[PDB]
Amino acid sequence: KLWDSKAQGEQEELHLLKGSDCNLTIDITEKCLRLAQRSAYQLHTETSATKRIQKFFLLGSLNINKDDRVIINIDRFDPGRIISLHVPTAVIPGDVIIPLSMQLACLSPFSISEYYDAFQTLTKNLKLSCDSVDIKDMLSLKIHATYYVDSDEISINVTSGVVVPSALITAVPILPVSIVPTALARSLSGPLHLSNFQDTQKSGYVAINNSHNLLLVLDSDPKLSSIPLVGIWVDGVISIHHPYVWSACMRYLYSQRLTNKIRDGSTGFILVLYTQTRPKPEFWECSFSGKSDKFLYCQASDDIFMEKVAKTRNEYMRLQLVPNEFGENLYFQ
C-alpha cells in the first residue's frame, strides 16, 4: 500500500548492453600494446625471474555514445605495483582496470572456470561496495596476449574476454508518488536538473516515512545501512534505457550494505527518474525474479602485426563482443 502499482505504460526490460544491441565494443591502441610488449620482452630476456606468463594491466575509459552503445577505450599500459598483491600504479577515477596476461609464443584461451572466478569477484564487489554507482562495476574485462618477435616484425594475438551479469530488470511506468520536499528533492526537481552533458549521472536511495511518503537520500548517507529503503532515484540521464539506470538497480538489489530494503526485486521497488529532457520526474516500479548468479560471457580475438620501428600514428584495434548465456559471441561481420 506504499504506492499504486497499476501499469501506466508498456513494460521495459533493462540491461547493461540493451541500447547497444547486446554489443560491447573494445578499442585498443597500438601504442599501449607496443608498450606492453616492449615491457614484457625486456623482462623475459634481460631478466631471469620472469614468470612464463607476465601479469600487467591495461587502463581504459568507459564511453556511451550512440543510443546507449557502450565502448571501452583502452589506451594505457601499466605494469602495476606489488604490495602480497598485484595492483595498478595509480588508480584514476573513471579507469577501467583490465588485467593483461601475456606470454612469448613458442613450440591462450578463456575457459568457463576463468569466467566464473571473474564473475564471483564482480558480484562480491557489488555486494560489499560502499561507493557511488559505477557502470564499470557491471563488467569484468580481461585480455590475453600472445606475442612473438623475429627480425622483421612484432606479432601479437590479442584475445579479450568479458563477463556481465545477465539479470534483466523489469520496469513498469506507474503513477507519480508524493515526495517529501526536502532540500535534495527540491534541487532535483529544480531548474538545474535540465542539462545536456554526458556522464553527469548521480543516484541515491529512497526511504519512506509513517505517512507513506518518499524521502530521497544521498548515496553517501551513513544511515543507508539500516534506514528502511524502498528503491532508488537516478538523475542525469535522457531515458530509462541508459545503462546507468540498470547499474543503479543492480547495485540496489545486490548490496548487502543496505540491510533494511523492505522493497526489493521480488516485491518490486520504486525508481524516481529525473531525466534531463523533462521538467518532472518519471516513476517506475522495477522488479527482478530470475537467476541471481547467472552471467553473460564471450571472447573475441584478432592478430596485429607491428613494425620494429614505431610510427607516430593513432592506429588501434577494434574488437566486438556480443556475449550470451552460452559463451557464444553473436557478432557477424
Numbering used by the authors: 13 to 95, 103 to 126, 132 to 357
Paper text:
Here we demonstrate that CEP85 is essential for faithful centriole duplication through a direct interaction with the previously uncharacterised N-terminal domain of STIL, a key factor involved in the early steps of centriole formation. Subsequently, through its C-terminal PB3, PLK4 interacts with STIL and phosphorylates it, enabling STIL to recruit SASS6 to the site of procentriole assembly.
